[PDB]
């Protein structure tokens, strides 16, 4: 089971929502600020998707 | 009736609550989510809010502030669950939205306002991955103020011999909580690093959640306010302890379990903490 998607930094948002939704059809994907303070509990459902201010990838992807 | 959760069990806290001890007077800032206050097994003292386009502290869009909040302070009576510190003065200070994400301006205005508020004790069910002068020097303020800081250790699990504590978690300052389940073993997701100090459960945690629910999370998240109700035990039973010795209590009466790069100190028992004199189990 694919969990995390290094291979996505530096990729649009909406390239690594179809590549997550390909191995993970249903991921609850939520995209955030990079550099943002978040919750810390772990959602197996979950992908956040952390991007810059031009939105792309800025931190790999993971599950949780 | 009331069911109280494995978790509350398993650091000993019953044992606190028999002595007649359960967090009463100390005032404990979930800095979150927000807190649902119309939860009837809650009950909320006060609070604000640091989200600009969120400005009731008192409506939680998430969930997750108001369940970390049930994990600290769920009141003892007849229905729900039980709290670590069921009497505890509980404080919801916003600095998170519905998306559960904050800038980290709003997350240092809610240590701020815990600071000129008089909280005894802080958890920050929360974190980033960078750390930033602004935020140490608001939890070493906190610290060096008397404030008890709790945080979660992050959910990043391993990187080899890295660590993959977050911030606030990983600055000496704050008390950094990573999670086992109900057998002692770590969470497969619970962030690890030199950083780690204590464990506590974080895996199916019974709670509040709003609109007068429950239900069973799982992450540090959870794992970090069984630590700051564990603190707020520990100041009713000896308040005048200060923030330094609640800590060392808590670190020097772990239980302890592997490794401290995967494990910290151990799992905390509060029944031990709580005596005047300490040691491991
Ligand atoms: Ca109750
Ligand atoms: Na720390």
């Known amino acids: 089971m694919k969990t995390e998607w290094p291979e996505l930094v530096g990729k649009s948002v909406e390239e690594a929502k179809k590549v997550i939704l390909q191995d993970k059809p249903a991921a609850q994907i ?6 943002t303070i978040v919750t810390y509990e772990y959602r197996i459902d979950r992908v956040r998707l952390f ?7 800025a931190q790999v992807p993971r599950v949780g | 009736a009331q069911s109280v959760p494995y978790g509350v069990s398993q650091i000993k806290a019953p044992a606190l609550h028999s002595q007649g001890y359960t967090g009463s007077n100390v005032k404990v800032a979930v800095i979150d989510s927000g ?3 119309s939860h009837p097994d809650l009950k909320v003292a006060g609070g604000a809010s640091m989200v600009p386009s969120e400005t009731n502290p008192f409506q939680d869009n998430n969930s997750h502030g108001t369940h970390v909040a049930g994990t600290v302070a769920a009141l003892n009576n007849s229905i729900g669950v039980l709290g670590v510190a069921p009497s505890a003065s509980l404080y919801a200070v916003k600095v998170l939205g519905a998306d559960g994400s904050g800038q980290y301006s ?9 600071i000129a508020n008089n909280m005894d004790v802080i958890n920050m069910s929360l974190g980033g991955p960078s750390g930033s002068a602004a935020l140490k020097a608001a939890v070493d303020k906190a610290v060096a103020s008397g404030v008890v800081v709790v945080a979660a250790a992050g959910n990043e699990g391993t990187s080899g011999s890295s ?6 978690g990983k600055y000496p300052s704050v008390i950094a909580v990573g999670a086992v389940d109900s ?17 506590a459960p974080g895996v199916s945690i019974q709670s509040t959640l709003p609109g007068n629910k429950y239900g069973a999370y799982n992450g540090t998240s959870m794992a970090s306010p069984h630590v700051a109700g564990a603190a707020a035990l520990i100041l009713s039973k000896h308040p005048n302890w200060t923030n330094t010795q609640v800590r060392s ?7 302890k379990l592997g490794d401290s790069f995967y494990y910290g100190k151990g799992l905390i028992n509060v029944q031990a903490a709580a005596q005047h004199h300490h040691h491991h189990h």
Not at chain 2, 106 to 114: F, K, L, M, T
Not at chain 2, 184 to 198: H, K, T
Not at chain 2, 249 to 255: Q, V
């Open chain 2, 163 to 168: 660590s993959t504590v977050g911030y606030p």
């Open chain 1, 30 to 35: 939520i995209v955030l600020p990079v550099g």
């Open chain 2, 106 to 114: 709003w997350i240092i205005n809610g240590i701020e306002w815990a």
């Open chain 1, 51 to 57: 991007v810059d201010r031009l939105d792309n990838i």
């Open chain 2, 183 to 199: 057998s002692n073993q770590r969470a497969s997701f619970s962030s690890v690093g030199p950083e780690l100090d204590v464990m």
């Open chain 2, 35 to 37: 807190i649902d206050s």
């Open chain 2, 249 to 255: 209590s808590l670190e020097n009466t772990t239980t």
